[PDB]
């Protein structure tokens, strides 16, 4: 399936994944094109924060669903 | 100044905490005692799969905004 990852600049990016793909593996996929380590990535859906252990199907994410991304650039 | 962190029990109870990054593991447990009633004597906190030592800090362990800990009780 296909999903969209939205930043804060408005620069929405495309992606391709399976339901069985882990949250950790998704952040790694964004790194390959965006150049930001997974541990600096915060992924959001439906209002929930997503944990690096569940899968896409756990939070029940479908095709063409939007994810929101927050970067850890400043700590605290 | 203040951060928000989550503390997950294994009973499926999640408590939200207000902490400073500069806060110590001891103060965290004391905050857990303050609203939950569980003694610091009998608390054991986990982050990134490691136990957290009393004398150290939240920042020592790279605990960040909206991070999640697990709380395991001892007997």
């Amino acid at each position, epitope marked *: 399936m296909q999903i969209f990852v939205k930043t*804060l*600049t408005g620069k929405t990016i495309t992606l391709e994944v399976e339901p069985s793909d882990t949250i950790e593996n998704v952040k790694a996929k964004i790194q390959d094109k965006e*150049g*930001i*380590p997974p541990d*600096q990535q915060r992924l959001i859906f439906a209002g929930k924060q997503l944990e690096d252990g569940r899968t896409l199907s756990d939070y029940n994410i479908q095709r063409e669903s939007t994810l929101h991304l927050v*970067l*850890r*650039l*400043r*700590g*605290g | *100044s203040h951060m928000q962190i989550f503390v997950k029990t294994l009973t499926g109870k999640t408590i939200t905490l207000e902490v*400073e*990054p*500069s806060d*110590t593991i001891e103060n965290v447990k004391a905050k857990i005692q303050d609203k939950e009633g569980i003694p610091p004597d009998q608390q054991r906190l986990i982050f990134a799969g490691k136990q957290l030592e009393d004398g*150290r*800090t*939240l*920042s*020592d362990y*790279n605990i*960040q905004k909206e991070s999640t800990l697990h709380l395991v009780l001892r007997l």
Partner: antibody
Framework: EVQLVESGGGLVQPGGSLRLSCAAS????????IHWVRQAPGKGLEWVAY????????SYADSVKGRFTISADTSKNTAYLQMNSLRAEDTAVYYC?????????????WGQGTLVTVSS | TQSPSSLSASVGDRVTITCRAS??????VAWYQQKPGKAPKLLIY???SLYSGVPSRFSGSRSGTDFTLTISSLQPEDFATYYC???????????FGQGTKVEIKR
């Protein structure tokens, strides 16, 4: 290994302008922020500006705001400090540095600094 | 803007430098050590935690609104200048305090 090498320092008339460069290596600047900080001879540190290269957002000290322009070029991995309306009191060594989320606001790597002197 | 203030101490002394602070400013206070001719080095971050490779004789503490740097027993290489750094979430401005130069008593 992380390195920050600043250049472009030197001599300007009051009123003149100058561009400082800060070339980074051993890490990618878009994974954090880059700061400029200056130190007048025999005096304390003074924060000047910071940029977050990934977004392009900036912040400036009061003593510098209307006349300095911090900026970054990700492809070159370099950060710049464009200094206009320069005045004698701007005389200092200028360091660039970086903050990485893991050190909770603190600046962990600093270059050796370049000398800017403003005088007629 | 100003010259650092001077502290006279002997090898083995306990030194506590304080950094006066505001309610506005965040408790993410950092400390740096700077030697003559060279760039500052990070000692303490987030008020009281040690940067990688900093000796244990360095500690940091929060005295209410104020923040402190302590060196429990002064070694010869500790004689230098120390700066606190503050950060405000409201303005996104950073500020370094005056700077304290510890010199050797004899």
């Amino acid at each position: 290994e992380v390195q920050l090498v600043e250049s472009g320092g030197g001599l300007v008339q009051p009123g003149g302008s100058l561009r400082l460069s800060c070339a980074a290596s051993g890490f990618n600047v878009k994974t954090g922020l880059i700061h400029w900080v200056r130190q007048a001879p025999g005096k304390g540190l003074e924060w000047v500006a910071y940029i977050t290269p990934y977004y392009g957002s900036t912040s400036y000290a009061d003593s510098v705001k209307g006349r300095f322009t911090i900026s970054a070029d990700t492809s070159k991995n370099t950060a710049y400090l464009q200094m206009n309306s320069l005045r004698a009191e701007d005389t200092a060594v200028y360091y660039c540095a970086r903050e990485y989320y893991r050190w909770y606001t603190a600046i962990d790597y600093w270059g050796q600094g370049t000398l800017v002197t403003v005088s007629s | 803007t100003q010259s650092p203030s001077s502290l006279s101490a002997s090898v083995g002394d306990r030194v506590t430098i304080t950094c006066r602070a505001s309610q506005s400013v965040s408790s993410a206070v950092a400390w740096y050590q700077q030697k003559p001719g060279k760039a500052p080095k990070l000692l303490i971050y987030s008020a009281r935690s040690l940067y990688s490779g900093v000796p244990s004789r360095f500690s940091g503490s929060r005295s209410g609104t104020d923040f402190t740097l302590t060196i429990s027993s002064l070694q010869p290489e500790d004689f230098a200048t120390y700066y606190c750094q503050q950060y405000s979430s409201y303005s996104s401005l950073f500020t370094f305090g005056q700077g304290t130069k510890v010199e050797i008593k004899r």
